[PDB]
Ligand binder design. Structure first.
Ligand SMILES: [Mg+2]
Ligand SMILES: [Zn+2]
Ligand SMILES: [Zn+2]
Ligand SMILES: [Zn+2]
Ligand SMILES: [Zn+2]
Lengths: 608, 111, 355
């Protein structure tokens, strides 16, 4: 507080929130920045100068809390300041630029916070010498304090691979973080891989920014890069591998993703299909070349329950290979306990994380700081939406009025079956039937998401068009997928948690949700990203269409609000629709008669 | 050129697209009294050259006979051929390096 | 530093309007706007699409043309699917063509253009037109090409022989054949093949096309024309009209053959003679009596007055915004200069100053 700040009569519910004690600079017209010192928040104008220069700086040193079109709510965090000094930035420069572009005097607490969040950058480093995690620090000053720490037990010494994760967490805790910047040009101990950036690949500007933020020194800075759906993360990883030119391993959490990234990699880089050996229960071949790649999903390394000897040979081979680069695509699942064996198993130098969503239910997402590193780059979602890099969606949330026909049983149903009982409302069937009619009238490919296989198959059967879920085999689901894509008999399909994420299905510009998870925001966000990567995200007059059929009179409204609040905060609003269109103009409605409603009620009473 | 040069002295060699000037006395044993060019003293821009190093999908293109039957390069070539045809008002010309290269690529765009 | 750019832009603008001339300009006009409604105007490339904006701009064009020059008839023929379709005969009522254009609103633009067919039947529609009427056609065009049944050059020669001019407002860029049409029809002028750069420029171009055009000395048709002022009645009884054959409370009465009509400025249906009001003929007198431009006096020199002569406001003070009417020796503000030069058509300083 640069004032006396005598408490105003209107500042009572302003519990240290009345931010008028600051002496506002007369350059408030030009400068775009406020500071909120009560919570560390930052208030940013979208209509004053210096904001274009300050936007990347605020992303680097701060995190945004909310970014609508008019005012961006940012927040300086120690995580973001560590990311800033890891990119290469410092407290004094941050304070100087902040006072240069700030309308307001710089707060003492914020000054102290940025002073504290300055790391010993360059002091603590680790290298791998023949599959050997050697902790090579620049001084014995590091060795004294680290041996002073009781966990541990120029100059380089060994720390065990499982102990590497624990000591990285510990050194982050004592705020002595390690930078992992591979000198792949200087290191020739690893086999260099003759892969070249083909002229057929040219890079987007924000992707070039993402590379150069972690290629500022020419070394590969290890961390996270968060890019939206369809941004070209495969292209970013291909460019990083082609400019590293070493043995590289990339794991993604689907065999379909294995299968698609292998073809993407052999397409847009000069690595050879001989050098790429694909590992799965389809085939477990190995490449015998000095340099190349072996791809598998996380399952064929995590599992030890039912493993083949050829799988054992392959995982032995990858254990033997000292890789120079690792990318954990869809990094939201690798910090799970059966999945965080990556450091314990794979000897790889540079650790990059590419994913769409950097959020989850628990705090395992922050473990990537001592698993792979901080966020090296992020692309602004609404900026790419207006840039056409991702889509523009007219989301329409459908508040289906609850039928008492199903509510009378739903209220007296036990808790494990209340969910399946209120998913299956005949009014919801009626609304979905007219919505499918209306969007096939508009000529849009529609994909329907249900959390339950039986509800998915019942909706699919009432449509007369097939279903795909997680228990459906891969051959049947791809047959149904190609039937939907090319065959005009299959105009719409019925997808599930194999369709929510980790697939490339951007044709469906229309999406209707009949069910979802209880409170998993990431499933809903990935379902939105399924159509955010749509091909017609660039044409004029485009708005994608998202629909959520949710039953009234429940907790499902609060559930959908919880699942949607991340997208609302992103900028993907959820508009209110209760009275739908074309109600009764549709002649023939699924379970329209009350006898039909009681029929479906006792049909689902057979299970519930 | 030796009968020409040794039969006539007042011989003028000039063109519009000769560059570099010295390469022709390099390749042919003759010398000239002065070697200079002329810049375009233009009031405003009237010619707009472009170097297309990449297709619509940021995919580069080349005329190499080995990579000649590349369907992606075909797709790019037909792509900006179509686009420039749509935006071209009056008259446009195409210059491939070789007739066989034509005949192949025109027959398969005909496909 | 924006005022220097505004000043040099105003200088480069005023270099074109330095020469103001009292050319003989056509009053008995004959304006045709043909419309193409093809696949090109289906592009949404300009918001919302080219078809919608040309519809709206044509509405405005009809209104402005009938307001400024009510002494002409207006015909519209649409172009669609390789056929040119007449939708609006030449008429004195703009409302007929307004309704026809409203029909054109809901229908769908599609097909390919044929300027040969369009201009040929425009010629045929322009055939039974009296000598004093100035036959001229506005053409809008969005294609870069034209499918045609036969030659265009015979049509060009015939149009030149029959003393009809054209002006092309192309959409995308220049088309050489349209340049040829404009040049050959327009005595070698290049001031008729115009290409917009945005929708505001299109608006300005339409406003420019509203104005009457000067005529040529060699194209001499100086004659008289018979005219008749009618008389309006306000009768108690409804009475049958001659034109639409229905009961009318009021209506003008024919000065010659004493019939009655329903609208003006119109020709008689019975004695077949044109009927107007003196307001209608005086409407173009600003075109007949143009206004000289007003000069800003320089900021360095001594000033006759420091506040505006006409609107009575203080002149603002780097440069001097005192637009002087040299015909009345009074300086004015920019607002008054705009209003007198565009909306008004007299100089009140010259009204006060006795001659
Ligand atoms: Mg699925
Ligand atoms: Zn009448
Ligand atoms: Zn009469
Ligand atoms: Zn004035
Ligand atoms: Zn005057």
């Amino acid at each position: 507080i640069p004032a006396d700040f005598v408490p105003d009569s209107v500042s009572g519910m302003f519990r240290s929130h009345d931010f008028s004690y600051l002496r506002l600079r007369p350059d408030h017209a030009s400068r775009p920045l406020w500071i909120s010192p009560s919570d560390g928040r930052i208030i940013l104008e979208s209509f004053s100068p210096l904001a274009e220069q300050a936007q990347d700086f605020l992303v680097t040193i701060a995190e945004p809390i909310s970014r609508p079109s008019h005012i961006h709510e940012y927040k300086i965090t120690a995580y973001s300041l560590y990311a800033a000094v890891s990119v290469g930035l410092e407290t004094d420069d941050i304070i100087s630029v902040l006072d240069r572009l700030s309308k307001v005097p710089v707060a003492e607490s914020i000054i102290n916070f940025i002073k504290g969040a300055t790391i010993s950058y360059g002091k603590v480093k680790l290298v791998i010498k023949h599959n050997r995690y050697f902790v090579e620090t620049t001084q014995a000053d590091i060795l004294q304090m680290l041996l002073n720490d009781s966990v541990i037990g120029v100059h380089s010494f060994e720390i065990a691979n499982e102990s590497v994760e624990v000591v990285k967490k510990r050194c982050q805790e004592i705020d002595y973080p390690v930078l992992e910047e591979y000198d792949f040009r200087n290191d020739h101990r690893n086999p260099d891989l003759d892969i070249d950036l083909k002229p057929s690949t040219q890079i987007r500007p924000y992707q070039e920014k993402s590379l150069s933020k972690m290629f500022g020194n020419g070394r590969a800075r290890s961390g996270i890069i968060v890019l939206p759906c369809g941004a070209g993360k495969t292209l970013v990883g291909i460019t990083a591998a082609c400019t590293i030119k070493k043995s590289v391993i990339v794991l993604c959490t689907s065999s379909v993703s294995v299968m698609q990234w292998r073809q993407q990699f052999l397409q847009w880089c000069t690595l050879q299909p001989e050098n790429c050996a694909v590992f799965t229960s389809d085939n477990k071949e190995m490449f015998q070349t000095e340099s190349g790649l072996v791809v598998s999903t996380y399952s064929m390394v995590a599992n030890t329950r039912n493993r083949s000897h050829d799988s054992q040979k392959v995982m032995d081979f990858l254990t033997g290979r000292e890789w120079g680069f690792i990318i954990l695509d869809e990094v939201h699942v690798v910090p799970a306990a059966m999945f965080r064996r990556v450091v314990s198993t794979i000897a790889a130098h540079a650790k990059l994380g590419l994913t769409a969503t950097l959020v989850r239910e628990d705090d395992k997402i922050g473990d990537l700081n001592f698993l792979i590193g901080p966020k090296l780059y992020e692309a602004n979602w609404m900026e790419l939406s207006q840039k056409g890099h991702i889509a523009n969606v007219q989301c329409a949330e459908v508040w289906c009025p609850m039928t008492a026909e199903f509510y009378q049983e739903y209220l007296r149903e036990t808790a494990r079956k209340r969910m399946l009982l209120y998913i299956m409302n005949p009014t919801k069937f009626q609304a979905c039937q007219f919505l499918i009619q209306y969007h096939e009238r508009r000529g849009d490919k529609i994909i329907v998401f249900s959390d339950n296989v039986y509800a998915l198959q019942e909706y699919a059967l009432k449509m007369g068009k097939p279903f795909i879920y997680g228990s459906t085999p891969q051959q049947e689901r791809m047959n149904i997928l190609q039937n939907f894509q090319y065959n005009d008999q299959i105009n719409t399909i019925f997808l599930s948690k194999v369709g929510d994420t980790s697939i490339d299905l951007p044709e469906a510009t229309c999406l209707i949700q009949i069910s979802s998870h209880y409170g998993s925001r990431r499933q809903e966000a990935q379902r939105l990203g399924r159509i955010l990567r749509a091909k017609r995200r660039n044409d004029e007059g485009f708005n994608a269409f998202f629909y959520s059929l949710v039953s009234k009179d429940t907790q499902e409204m609060y559930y959908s609000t919880k699942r949607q609040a991340f997208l609302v905060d992103q900028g993907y609003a959820f508009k209110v629709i209760t009275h739908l269109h074309g109600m009764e103009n549709i002649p023939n409605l699924a379970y329209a008669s009350p006898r039909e409603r009681r029929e479906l009620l006792q049909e689902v009473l057979l299970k519930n | 050129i030796k009968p020409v040069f040794e039969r006539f002295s007042s011989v003028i060699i000039t063109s519009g697209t000769i560059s570099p000037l010295d390469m022709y006395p390099r390749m042919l044993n003759f010398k000239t009294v002065l070697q200079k060019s002329y810049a375009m003293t233009l009031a405003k821009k009237s010619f707009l050259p472009m170097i297309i190093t990449k297709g619509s999908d940021q995919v580069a293109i080349s005329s190499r006979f080995e990579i000649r039957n590349d369907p992606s390069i075909v797709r790019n070539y037909g792509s900006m051929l179509v686009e420039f045809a749509k935006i071209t008002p009056d008259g446009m010309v195409v210059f491939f390096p070789s007739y066989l290269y034509m005949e192949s690529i025109v027959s398969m765009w005909q496909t | 530093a924006s005022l220097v750019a505004s000043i040099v832009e105003a200088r480069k603008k005023r270099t074109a309007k330095k020469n103001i001339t009292p050319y003989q300009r056509g009053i008995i006009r004959s304006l045709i706007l043909t419309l193409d409604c093809s696949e090109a105007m289906l592009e949404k490339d300009l918001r919302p699409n080219r078809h919608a904006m040309i519809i709206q701009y044509a509405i405005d064009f009809v209104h402005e043309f009938f307001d400024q020059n009510p002494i002409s008839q207006m015909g519209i023929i649409i172009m669609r699917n390789g056929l040119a379709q007449l939708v609006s005969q030449v008429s004195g009522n703009p409302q007929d063509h307004i309704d026809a254009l409203k029909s054109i609103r809901k229908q769908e633009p599609k097909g390919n253009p044929s300027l040969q067919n369009a201009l040929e039947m425009a010629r045929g529609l322009l055939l039974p037109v009296p000598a004093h009427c100035t036959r001229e056609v506005l053409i809008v065009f969005g294609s870069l090409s034209t499918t045609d049944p036969g030659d265009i050059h015979q049509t060009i020669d015939s149009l030149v022989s029959e003393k009809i001019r054209v002006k092309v407002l192309g959409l995308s860029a220049q088309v050489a054949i349209c340049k040829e049409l404009c040049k050959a029809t327009n005595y070698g002028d290049e001031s008729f093949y115009k290409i917009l750069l945005d929708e505001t420029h299109l608006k300005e171009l339409f406003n420019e096309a509203v104005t009457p055009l000067p005529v040529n000395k060699i194209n001499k048709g100086f004659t008289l024309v018979k005219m008749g002022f009618p008389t309006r009645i306000f009768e108690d009884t409804p009475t049958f009209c001659s034109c639409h054959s229905k009961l009318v409370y009021g209506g003008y009465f024919c000065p010659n053959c004493h019939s009655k009509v329903c609208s003006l400025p119109t020709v008689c249906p019975c004695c077949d003679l044109m009927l107007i009001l003196s307001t209608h003929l005086a409407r173009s007198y600003h075109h007949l009596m143009p206004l000289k431009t007003f000069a800003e006096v320089p900021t360095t020199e001594k000033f006759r007055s420091e506040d505006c002569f006409s609107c009575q406001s203080r002149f603002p003070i780097l440069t001097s915004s005192r637009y002087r009417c040299e015909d009345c020796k009074q300086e004015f503000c920019v607002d008054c200069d705009v209003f007198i030069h565009e909306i008004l058509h007299n100089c009140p300083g010259c009204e006060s100053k006795p001659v």
